[PDB]
Structure formats: C-alpha cells, structure tokens
Amino acid sequence: TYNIILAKSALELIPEEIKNKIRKSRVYKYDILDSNYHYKAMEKLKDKEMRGRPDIIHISLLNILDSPINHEKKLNIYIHTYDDKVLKINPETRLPRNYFRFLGVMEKVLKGERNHLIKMEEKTLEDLLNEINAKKIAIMTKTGKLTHPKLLKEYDTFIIGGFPYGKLKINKEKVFGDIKEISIYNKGLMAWTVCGIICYSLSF
Amino acid sequence: TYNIILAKSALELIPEEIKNKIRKSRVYKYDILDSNYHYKAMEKLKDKEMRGRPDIIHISLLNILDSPINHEKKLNIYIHTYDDKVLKINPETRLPRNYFRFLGVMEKVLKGERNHLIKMEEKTLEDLLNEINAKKIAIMTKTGKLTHPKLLKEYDTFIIGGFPYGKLKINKEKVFGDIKEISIYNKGLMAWTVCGIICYSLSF
C-alpha cells in the first residue's frame, strides 16, 4: 500500500488575523479561505501566495480518488494543510464534483464535525510521516532529480505540495524515513497533474 | 502529433426546447445547461442523462492542458459537443480554475463571440475526424478491447465521451479512418481520468 500526501495544502478556515476583513456573502458563503474571493483581505497575510486555493486540492483529489490504483484499494490518502491539520481520505469517498459542494463538505470537517469518510486531526507533516511509518519518501519538486515515473514504485510514500507557489519546506531531521527529492518532468506542473502521473505510474 | 477529442460533450447553451421551464436565479447566471441547477427543467429533455455536465469538460481540460505531452506541443485538443459544435482549444489556453469563470468563457464561445485561443465551428464528430485526417482512432469505453496504456502510442486519435451516462456511437461508414473500441481498465472511469491516463501514456 502506498501513501500519497498533498502537503502544506492551501485548504484552511479563514485565518484569525484576517477574519475581520472577510464577511460571508451570498456569492461565497463558506468559511474556507479562497483567494478568488478574498484576495484583497489576504494582502498582509503570511505566505499569502501559497494559501487560499482549495481548488487545487479539489482537482487533485478528483484525480486520486478515481485512479485505478485507488479503485484497487492500494492507496492511503492524506491532505496535510498549511496550518497543520491532516485529513485522511477514505478510498471510497465520493467527492462532490461541484466546487461549492466540495467546500461545504471540507468546511464541516475542518470545523471538527464528524465525517465517517474524512477524518481530521491536528498534525504536522513530519509527525504524519512518522505515524504512518513512511520509510522511502519521494518529495515531488521540479528542482528534484529527474526520474522516469517507472521508478516511483520503489517508494512507499509520495509528497506533493497542495499549493500554487513556493517550495515545500520539511524538517528532514525530524523524519525517521529517508527523503529523496524527485522531478518527473523538466517544467513546473500543477499538483493535480503530478498526483495523476504518480497514480498512473503505480498501475502501468 | 496526437488528437484528443472529448466527444458528444455535455456542454451546451440552454436548449430552446426547455427555456420556458427555466427559472432564472442570481445563484446561477449562465446560459449553459447544468443539471445541478436545471434538473427539473430537464425532466423531459431528450438524452437528459448525458447532458448538462460542463464540469466533466472543465476537469478533463485542466488535466489535458497541463499534461507534459501538451507542454511539448504534441496534442491537438478538441471538444465536440452533444449538439455538434467543435471547439479547437489552443495548447496555450489558460483555462480558469474557477468553474464559474470557465462557464463564462465557454458561454461566449458557444454564442459565437470571437476567442483567439478557442475556435468554434458547427460540425459533426465524423466530419471533424475526416477533416483532421484521423487515421487510427481509439474510442475509449469500458466495453472495448482491454489494452495496456503503452499500446496507445500506436493510435493518432483518441475519443473520450465528454458525458456522464451513455455510450458513444459513431457512424462507421461516415469516417475515413479506422475506429477501434479500447478499454484501458475493467472498471468504468471518469472522463478526466481516462484523459489523464492517455496523456501520460503518451509522455512516458
């Protein structure tokens, strides 16, 4: 069984610092940060350029959940968020194709309401890796060593940044397993594309 | 280069047939059929189960446009719609990640408004195939010949149904190229997954 993790994911309830600049509207009623609707209120938010993009997770998760490797129940799926929450996603989760429906599901989970298919915990990325006993970990980044996807099968755990801009920063000294930075392509790709490539590498 | 075609796609302006049953609302201000908002008015719409699902095209295109094979400029991308319009999508199209923005773009294109990156003509699927000189055509469908992704490279043209339910029918005697039904997996997969798998099998 492989672990796939979308890490430092741009999926958060509205940060306390900017709550006062954001009101629920009929156009967007959710308490999830989304720069399409909240760009200006994010002006002075730390790391603003890597936050407020729930859509990246939505699309990545639509790829992951429908992959053959997932239909074969050979994945454990994790969303690690910017503010250190981890959502474990049941392989049989039927995720809404509608973006707003997706937001309403995620929003409840993030507020701690029980969802039997999506479990949430406060948890760092490093603690996550150690609890799942990750041993051979590939961090997908473009500055990584170019690797034909055929080799991805040698790892047990994959990490993909669930964000638009920046680099995934991980304290390797706090992680028991071995981490290798891997690039499967010479150009920058979106998270959902990397997720797809990994998932299909594992089937074919 | 390869052609990839999402065919008989559930992407249409609202059919005149049902405009009278449409109650317009500020929560959805697009003239594009979306069963999420128009289910009732679609109750006696012909082939309603395979229409009104523009998100399938949105997600599929997000996958196709960001694939390595497309960054390498080796794809011609086409959306053929249920009502016989063909959109040729420029490889460098930046498609909105927000669903509503996507509807906004598609709405204008379908109405005939010029768009230098997305060209629209009225045209049947069979005519499109002949006109682009598709020679070896693979139609993806879960009742087709089970085939390993690696073999996809032998075809020049791929057809994936841009719809939720139904099977895709093409008039064999109206197409100059050879059509073959392919299945790359034994469970039914969503269109975006099939598109992703094809695209990645062309790169690796």
Coordinates of C-alpha atoms in Angstrom, one line a residue:
Chain A
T1 CA 0.0 0.0 0.0
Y2 CA 1.3 3.5 -1.0
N3 CA 0.8 6.7 0.9
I4 CA 0.0 9.8 -1.2
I5 CA 0.2 13.1 0.7
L6 CA -0.8 16.6 -0.5
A7 CA 1.3 18.7 1.9
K8 CA 1.2 22.3 3.1
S9 CA -2.2 22.3 1.3
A10 CA -3.9 25.7 0.6
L11 CA -7.0 24.5 2.4
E12 CA -7.9 26.4 5.5
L13 CA -10.6 28.0 7.5
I14 CA -10.2 31.8 7.4
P15 CA -7.1 32.7 9.4
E16 CA -7.8 34.6 12.6
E17 CA -5.5 37.5 11.5
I18 CA -7.8 38.4 8.6
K19 CA -11.2 37.3 9.9
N20 CA -12.1 41.0 10.4
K21 CA -11.6 41.7 6.7
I22 CA -13.8 38.9 5.4
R23 CA -17.6 38.5 5.6
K24 CA -19.8 35.7 4.3
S25 CA -21.7 36.6 1.2
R26 CA -24.3 35.0 -1.0
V27 CA -21.7 34.8 -3.7
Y28 CA -19.4 32.8 -1.4
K29 CA -20.8 31.7 2.0
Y30 CA -18.0 29.4 3.1
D31 CA -15.5 29.9 5.9
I32 CA -12.8 28.4 3.7
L33 CA -10.1 30.9 2.5
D34 CA -10.2 31.3 -1.3
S35 CA -8.1 34.0 -3.0
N36 CA -10.6 34.2 -5.9
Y37 CA -13.0 35.8 -3.4
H38 CA -10.7 37.0 -0.6
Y39 CA -7.6 38.3 -2.5
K40 CA -7.6 41.8 -1.0
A41 CA -8.2 40.6 2.6
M42 CA -5.1 38.4 2.1
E43 CA -2.9 41.4 1.3
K44 CA -0.9 41.2 4.6
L45 CA -1.3 37.5 5.2
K46 CA 1.9 35.5 5.8
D47 CA 2.7 33.2 2.8
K48 CA -0.4 34.6 1.1
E49 CA 0.9 33.4 -2.2
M50 CA 0.7 29.8 -1.2
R51 CA -2.7 29.9 0.6
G52 CA -6.3 30.2 -0.3
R53 CA -6.5 27.7 -3.2
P54 CA -9.0 24.9 -2.2
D55 CA -9.5 24.2 -5.9
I56 CA -6.0 22.7 -6.2
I57 CA -7.0 20.0 -3.5
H58 CA -10.4 19.5 -5.1
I59 CA -9.0 18.7 -8.6
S60 CA -6.1 16.7 -7.2
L61 CA -8.5 14.6 -5.1
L62 CA -10.7 14.0 -8.1
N63 CA -7.7 12.6 -9.9
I64 CA -6.5 10.5 -7.0
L65 CA -9.9 9.0 -6.0
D66 CA -10.8 7.9 -9.5
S67 CA -7.4 6.4 -10.3
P68 CA -7.1 2.6 -10.9
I69 CA -4.6 2.3 -8.1
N70 CA -7.2 3.7 -5.7
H71 CA -10.0 1.5 -7.1
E72 CA -7.7 -1.3 -6.3
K73 CA -7.5 0.0 -2.7
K74 CA -3.7 0.4 -2.9
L75 CA -3.5 3.9 -1.6
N76 CA -3.8 5.7 1.7
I77 CA -4.6 9.4 1.0
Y78 CA -3.7 12.4 3.1
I79 CA -4.3 16.1 2.9
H80 CA -1.8 17.9 5.1
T81 CA -2.7 21.6 5.4
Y82 CA -0.8 24.8 5.7
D83 CA -2.0 25.2 9.3
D84 CA -1.0 21.6 10.3
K85 CA -4.2 19.6 10.0
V86 CA -4.3 16.3 8.3
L87 CA -7.3 14.9 6.7
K88 CA -7.3 11.2 6.0
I89 CA -9.5 10.4 3.0
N90 CA -11.3 7.1 2.7
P91 CA -10.6 5.5 -0.7
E92 CA -14.3 5.1 -1.2
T93 CA -15.0 8.8 -0.6
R94 CA -17.3 10.1 -3.3
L95 CA -16.1 13.7 -3.5
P96 CA -18.5 16.3 -5.0
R97 CA -17.6 17.3 -8.5
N98 CA -19.2 20.6 -7.7
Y99 CA -16.6 23.0 -6.2
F100 CA -19.1 24.7 -3.8
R101 CA -20.4 21.3 -2.6
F102 CA -16.8 20.3 -2.0
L103 CA -16.2 23.5 0.0
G104 CA -19.2 22.7 2.2
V105 CA -18.0 19.2 2.9
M106 CA -14.4 20.3 3.7
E107 CA -15.7 23.2 5.8
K108 CA -17.5 20.9 8.2
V109 CA -14.6 18.5 8.5
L110 CA -12.3 21.4 9.2
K111 CA -14.6 22.7 12.0
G112 CA -14.4 19.2 13.5
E113 CA -17.8 17.9 12.6
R114 CA -17.7 14.1 12.3
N115 CA -17.4 12.8 8.8
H116 CA -17.1 9.0 8.6
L117 CA -15.1 9.0 5.3
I118 CA -12.8 12.0 6.0
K119 CA -11.0 12.2 9.4
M120 CA -9.3 15.3 10.6
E121 CA -6.5 15.7 13.2
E122 CA -4.1 18.4 14.3
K123 CA -0.8 17.1 13.0
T124 CA 2.4 18.3 11.4
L125 CA 3.7 16.8 8.2
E126 CA 6.7 15.3 10.0
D127 CA 4.5 13.7 12.6
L128 CA 2.3 12.4 9.8
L129 CA 5.2 10.7 8.1
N130 CA 6.4 9.0 11.3
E131 CA 3.0 7.8 12.4
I132 CA 2.3 6.1 9.0
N133 CA 5.8 4.6 9.3
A134 CA 7.0 6.1 5.9
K135 CA 10.4 4.7 5.0
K136 CA 11.1 5.6 1.4
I137 CA 9.7 9.0 0.7
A138 CA 9.6 10.9 -2.6
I139 CA 9.1 14.6 -2.4
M140 CA 7.9 15.8 -5.8
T141 CA 9.5 19.1 -6.7
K142 CA 10.9 20.4 -10.1
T143 CA 14.4 21.1 -8.6
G144 CA 14.5 17.4 -7.8
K145 CA 16.5 14.7 -9.6
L146 CA 14.8 13.8 -12.9
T147 CA 13.3 10.4 -12.5
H148 CA 11.3 8.3 -15.0
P149 CA 7.9 7.6 -13.3
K150 CA 8.6 3.9 -13.7
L151 CA 10.9 4.1 -10.6
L152 CA 8.3 5.7 -8.4
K153 CA 7.2 2.1 -7.5
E154 CA 10.4 1.8 -5.3
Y155 CA 9.0 4.3 -2.8
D156 CA 6.2 3.9 -0.2
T157 CA 5.2 7.5 0.3
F158 CA 4.8 10.5 -2.1
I159 CA 4.6 14.1 -1.1
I160 CA 3.1 16.8 -3.5
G161 CA 2.7 20.4 -2.5
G162 CA -1.0 21.2 -2.4
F163 CA -0.3 24.9 -3.2
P164 CA 0.3 27.2 -6.2
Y165 CA 3.6 28.9 -5.4
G166 CA 6.6 28.3 -3.2
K167 CA 8.6 25.3 -2.2
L168 CA 7.7 22.6 0.3
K169 CA 9.9 23.0 3.4
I170 CA 10.3 20.0 5.5
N171 CA 12.5 19.4 8.6
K172 CA 14.3 16.2 7.5
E173 CA 15.9 15.8 10.9
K174 CA 12.5 15.2 12.4
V175 CA 11.6 12.5 9.9
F176 CA 12.5 8.8 10.5
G177 CA 12.2 7.7 6.9
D178 CA 14.6 8.6 4.1
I179 CA 13.6 11.5 1.9
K180 CA 14.6 11.9 -1.8
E181 CA 13.6 15.0 -3.9
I182 CA 12.3 13.8 -7.2
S183 CA 11.4 15.5 -10.5
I184 CA 9.4 13.5 -13.1
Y185 CA 9.4 16.4 -15.6
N186 CA 11.7 19.4 -16.6
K187 CA 8.9 22.0 -16.4
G188 CA 6.7 23.1 -13.4
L189 CA 3.5 21.1 -13.2
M190 CA 0.3 21.7 -11.3
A191 CA -0.3 19.5 -8.2
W192 CA -3.2 17.6 -9.8
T193 CA -1.0 16.7 -12.8
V194 CA 1.8 15.4 -10.5
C195 CA -0.8 13.4 -8.5
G196 CA -2.2 11.9 -11.7
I197 CA 1.2 11.0 -13.0
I198 CA 2.2 9.3 -9.8
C199 CA -1.1 7.4 -9.5
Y200 CA -0.9 6.1 -13.1
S201 CA 2.8 5.2 -12.7
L202 CA 1.7 2.8 -9.9
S203 CA -0.7 1.0 -12.2
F204 CA 1.1 0.8 -15.5
Chain B
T1 CA 1.1 14.9 -33.0
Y2 CA -1.9 13.3 -31.4
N3 CA -5.6 14.4 -31.4
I4 CA -7.6 14.2 -28.3
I5 CA -11.3 14.6 -28.6
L6 CA -13.9 14.9 -25.8
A7 CA -17.0 14.0 -27.9
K8 CA -20.7 14.4 -27.5
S9 CA -19.8 16.6 -24.6
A10 CA -22.4 17.7 -22.1
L11 CA -21.5 21.4 -22.8
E12 CA -24.4 23.3 -24.4
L13 CA -26.2 26.6 -24.3
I14 CA -29.7 26.1 -22.7
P15 CA -31.8 24.2 -25.3
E16 CA -34.7 26.3 -26.6
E17 CA -36.8 23.2 -26.1
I18 CA -36.7 23.9 -22.3
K19 CA -36.1 27.7 -21.8
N20 CA -39.7 28.1 -20.7
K21 CA -39.2 25.8 -17.7
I22 CA -36.0 27.6 -16.6
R23 CA -36.5 29.9 -13.6
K24 CA -33.5 32.3 -13.7
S25 CA -31.7 32.9 -10.5
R26 CA -28.8 35.0 -9.2
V27 CA -27.1 32.0 -7.8
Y28 CA -26.5 30.8 -11.4
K29 CA -26.3 33.4 -14.1
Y30 CA -25.1 31.4 -17.1
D31 CA -26.9 30.3 -20.3
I32 CA -25.1 26.9 -20.1
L33 CA -27.0 23.8 -19.2
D34 CA -26.1 22.5 -15.8
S35 CA -28.1 19.7 -14.3
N36 CA -27.1 20.9 -10.8
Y37 CA -29.3 24.0 -11.4
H38 CA -31.7 22.8 -14.2
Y39 CA -32.5 19.2 -13.2
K40 CA -36.3 19.9 -13.1
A41 CA -36.5 21.8 -16.4
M42 CA -34.5 18.8 -17.9
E43 CA -37.0 16.2 -16.8
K44 CA -38.4 15.6 -20.3
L45 CA -35.2 16.6 -22.2
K46 CA -34.1 14.1 -24.7
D47 CA -30.9 12.2 -23.5
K48 CA -31.0 14.2 -20.3
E49 CA -28.8 11.7 -18.5
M50 CA -25.9 12.6 -20.8
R51 CA -26.4 16.3 -21.0
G52 CA -25.8 19.3 -18.7
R53 CA -22.5 18.3 -17.1
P54 CA -20.0 21.0 -18.1
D55 CA -17.8 20.2 -15.1
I56 CA -16.7 17.0 -16.8
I57 CA -15.2 19.1 -19.6
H58 CA -13.7 21.6 -17.2
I59 CA -11.8 19.0 -15.1
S60 CA -10.8 17.0 -18.2
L61 CA -9.3 20.1 -19.9
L62 CA -7.5 21.1 -16.7
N63 CA -5.8 17.7 -16.9
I64 CA -5.1 17.7 -20.7
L65 CA -3.8 21.3 -20.8
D66 CA -1.3 20.8 -18.0
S67 CA 0.0 17.4 -19.2
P68 CA 3.6 17.1 -20.3
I69 CA 2.6 15.9 -23.7
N70 CA 0.7 19.2 -24.1
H71 CA 3.7 21.3 -22.8
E72 CA 5.6 19.6 -25.5
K73 CA 3.1 20.8 -28.0
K74 CA 2.3 17.3 -29.3
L75 CA -1.5 17.5 -28.9
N76 CA -4.4 18.8 -30.9
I77 CA -7.3 19.3 -28.5
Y78 CA -11.0 19.2 -29.4
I79 CA -14.3 19.5 -27.6
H80 CA -17.1 18.1 -29.7
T81 CA -20.5 18.8 -28.1
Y82 CA -23.8 16.9 -27.9
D83 CA -25.3 19.4 -30.4
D84 CA -22.4 19.3 -32.9
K85 CA -20.2 22.2 -32.1
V86 CA -16.5 21.8 -32.2
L87 CA -14.2 23.9 -30.1
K88 CA -10.5 23.7 -31.0
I89 CA -8.5 24.5 -27.9
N90 CA -5.1 26.2 -28.3
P91 CA -2.4 24.3 -26.4
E92 CA -1.5 27.5 -24.6
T93 CA -5.0 28.3 -23.4
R94 CA -5.0 29.2 -19.7
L95 CA -8.3 27.7 -18.6
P96 CA -9.9 29.3 -15.5
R97 CA -9.5 27.1 -12.4
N98 CA -12.8 28.5 -11.1
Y99 CA -15.8 26.7 -12.5
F100 CA -18.0 29.8 -12.9
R101 CA -15.2 31.6 -14.7
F102 CA -14.9 28.6 -17.0
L103 CA -18.7 28.8 -17.7
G104 CA -18.3 32.5 -18.5
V105 CA -15.6 31.8 -21.1
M106 CA -17.5 28.8 -22.6
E107 CA -20.8 30.8 -22.7
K108 CA -19.3 33.4 -25.0
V109 CA -17.6 30.9 -27.2
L110 CA -20.7 28.9 -27.8
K111 CA -22.7 32.1 -28.6
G112 CA -20.2 32.8 -31.4
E113 CA -18.1 35.5 -29.8
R114 CA -14.5 35.5 -31.1
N115 CA -11.8 34.0 -28.9
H116 CA -8.3 33.8 -30.3
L117 CA -7.5 30.7 -28.2
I118 CA -10.7 28.7 -28.5
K119 CA -12.3 28.4 -32.0
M120 CA -15.8 27.3 -32.5
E121 CA -17.4 25.7 -35.6
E122 CA -20.6 23.8 -36.2
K123 CA -19.5 20.4 -37.1
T124 CA -20.3 16.7 -36.5
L125 CA -17.9 14.3 -34.9
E126 CA -17.5 12.3 -38.1
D127 CA -16.8 15.4 -40.2
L128 CA -14.2 16.6 -37.6
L129 CA -12.4 13.2 -37.8
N130 CA -12.3 13.3 -41.6
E131 CA -11.1 16.9 -41.7
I132 CA -8.2 16.4 -39.3
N133 CA -7.3 13.1 -41.2
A134 CA -7.7 10.9 -38.1
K135 CA -6.4 7.6 -39.3
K136 CA -6.2 5.2 -36.3
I137 CA -8.9 6.2 -33.9
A138 CA -9.2 4.8 -30.4
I139 CA -12.6 5.2 -28.8
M140 CA -12.3 4.8 -25.0
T141 CA -15.2 2.9 -23.4
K142 CA -15.4 0.1 -20.7
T143 CA -16.8 -2.4 -23.2
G144 CA -13.8 -2.1 -25.6
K145 CA -10.8 -4.3 -26.0
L146 CA -8.7 -4.4 -22.9
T147 CA -5.4 -2.7 -23.8
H148 CA -2.3 -1.6 -21.9
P149 CA -1.7 2.1 -21.9
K150 CA 1.7 1.5 -23.5
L151 CA 0.0 0.5 -26.7
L152 CA -1.9 3.8 -27.0
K153 CA 1.1 5.3 -28.8
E154 CA 0.1 3.3 -31.9
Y155 CA -3.1 5.5 -32.4
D156 CA -3.1 9.1 -33.6
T157 CA -6.5 10.0 -32.4
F158 CA -8.3 9.4 -29.1
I159 CA -12.0 9.9 -28.4
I160 CA -13.4 10.1 -24.9
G161 CA -17.1 10.7 -24.2
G162 CA -17.5 14.1 -22.5
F163 CA -20.6 12.9 -20.7
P164 CA -21.7 11.0 -17.6
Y165 CA -24.0 8.3 -18.9
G166 CA -24.5 6.5 -22.2
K167 CA -22.2 5.0 -24.7
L168 CA -20.7 6.9 -27.6
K169 CA -21.9 6.0 -31.1
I170 CA -20.2 7.0 -34.3
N171 CA -21.3 6.2 -37.9
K172 CA -18.6 3.9 -39.1
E173 CA -19.4 4.5 -42.8
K174 CA -19.1 8.2 -42.3
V175 CA -15.5 8.1 -41.1
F176 CA -12.5 7.5 -43.4
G177 CA -10.1 6.4 -40.6
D178 CA -10.2 3.0 -38.7
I179 CA -12.1 3.1 -35.5
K180 CA -11.3 0.7 -32.6
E181 CA -13.0 0.4 -29.3
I182 CA -10.4 0.4 -26.5
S183 CA -10.7 -0.3 -22.8
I184 CA -7.7 0.6 -20.6
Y185 CA -9.3 -0.7 -17.4
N186 CA -12.0 -3.1 -16.3
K187 CA -13.9 -0.6 -14.1
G188 CA -15.7 2.4 -15.6
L189 CA -13.5 5.5 -15.2
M190 CA -14.5 9.3 -15.3
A191 CA -13.6 11.1 -18.5
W192 CA -10.9 13.2 -16.8
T193 CA -9.1 10.1 -15.5
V194 CA -9.2 8.5 -19.0
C195 CA -7.8 11.7 -20.5
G196 CA -5.1 11.8 -17.9
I197 CA -4.1 8.2 -18.4
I198 CA -3.9 8.7 -22.2
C199 CA -1.9 11.9 -21.9
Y200 CA 0.6 10.4 -19.5
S201 CA 0.9 7.2 -21.6
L202 CA 2.0 9.4 -24.5
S203 CA 4.8 11.0 -22.5
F204 CA 6.3 8.1 -20.6

